[PDB]
Amino acid sequence: GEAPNQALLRILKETEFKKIKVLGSGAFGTVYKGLWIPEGEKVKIPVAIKELREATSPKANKEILDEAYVMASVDNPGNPHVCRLLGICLTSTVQLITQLMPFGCLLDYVREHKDNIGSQYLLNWCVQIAKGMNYLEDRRLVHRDLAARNVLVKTPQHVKITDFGLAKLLGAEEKEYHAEGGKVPIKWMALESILHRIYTHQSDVWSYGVTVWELMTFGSKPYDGIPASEISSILEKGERLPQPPICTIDVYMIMVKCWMIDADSRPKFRELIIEFSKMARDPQRYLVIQGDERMHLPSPTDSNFYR
């Protein structure tokens, strides 16, 4: 049958890392920033730690361990654009240890660095995610949570994907997955995903569309001031996210194409890579950003030391 995934997980001790501050927070997530002191060795490395409330419920300890597995599984050959699980520690709570990305979740970076953002970078990233998401498709896994918050920034030239926790790995055949889930990110989901609770690879392509919309709108909220319950009902009326002000009509078409009701009529990921790569060569043509020429952002990775 299929090949064995020989990749391992470094199960490592608590005494060695010291958590500094909380980077991201949610009812589902409480992820820290914390330096790690690796036992005996004379090295110190920064890292991010993710934890949930102490294990009153085992089902809780199972769900977190599931995420550790899948995140673990991808080192595989490995990818430049996909985040790698570093380690794990065991405590009444169960801790995930992920190599920290300095600039944080990409969504925030766009909201604060709206100025000096390039017409180039935005196009470049979409290629970056489209590259990353295809690798997931190749692995027969659906991330199932793609969103702006879930893309990390190693450098302004490099971005990565993360937070698999919802995501579910796929066996051969096994084209689609249906699950009874308590909490999901409704706004970033496909119509069939909301109605039938069915998740596909093309379900992910939808979320991609909303994600790029978030990027092109500079970190605006999808559907500014609209309740979560109503959303399932309005989309079948045909309404989608409005055109972002800065998008040339070519780009918007690609965003709209990701929101087709027919799951097959949406673009596949290889298609998205090629389209955006083609745009990338001449960004000015495909993105009108005021004063785009001369934008500030820093090529060599010069100092970001200040906290």
Ligand X SMILES: *CCC(=O)Nc1ccc2ncnc(Nc3cccc(Br)c3)c2c1
Residues at the site binding ligand X, with contacts judged by CB under 6 A: 23-24, 31, 48-50, 96-98, 100-101, 104-105, 108, 149, 152, 162-163
Is 48 one of the annotated binding-site residues? Answer: no
Q: How far is the CB of 263 from ligand X (least distance, A)?
A: 28
Q: DSSP letters of 259-280?
A: T-SSTTSSPPHHHHHHHHHHHH
**DSSP-assigned letter for residue 242:** P
By beta-carbon proximity to ligand X, the closer residue of 101 and 273 is 101
Q: How far is the CB of 98 from ligand X (least distance, A)?
A: 3
By beta-carbon proximity to ligand X, the closer residue of 23 and 142 is 23
Is 28 one of the annotated binding-site residues? Answer: yes
Reply yes or no on whether 145 is catalytic.
Answer: yes
By beta-carbon proximity to ligand X, the closer residue of 50 and 131 is 50
Nearest Cα neighbor of 21 from 10, 30, 8, 11 is: 30
Whose tokens are 């995420």? That residue is 67
> What would the two tokens of residue 121 be?
């970078």
The residue annotated as part of the active site, out of 108, 115, 145, 302, is 145
Report the distance separating Cα 77 and Cα 63, nearest Å. 26
Is 122 one of the annotated binding-site residues? Answer: no
> What would the two tokens of residue 273 be?
């890579």
- No. of helices (H) and no. of strands (E), the chain: 9, 12
Residue 164 burial (CB < 10 Å; 0-12/13-18/19+)? Answer: buried
Is 163 one of the annotated binding-site residues? Answer: yes
Is 29 one of the annotated binding-site residues? Answer: yes
Q: How far is the CB of 38 from ligand X (least distance, A)?
A: 16
Nearest Cα neighbor of 205 from 247, 248, 163, 263 is: 263
By beta-carbon proximity to ligand X, the closer residue of 165 and 244 is 165
Q: How far is the CB of 118 from ligand X (least distance, A)?
A: 21
Report the distance separating Cα 49 and Cα 98, nearest Å. 6
Report the distance separating Cα 22 and Cα 36, nearest Å. 15
Binding-site residue numbers are 23-31, 50, 98-99, 163
Output the known binding site for ATP. 23-31, 50, 98-99, 163
Q: Which residues are catalytic?
A: 145
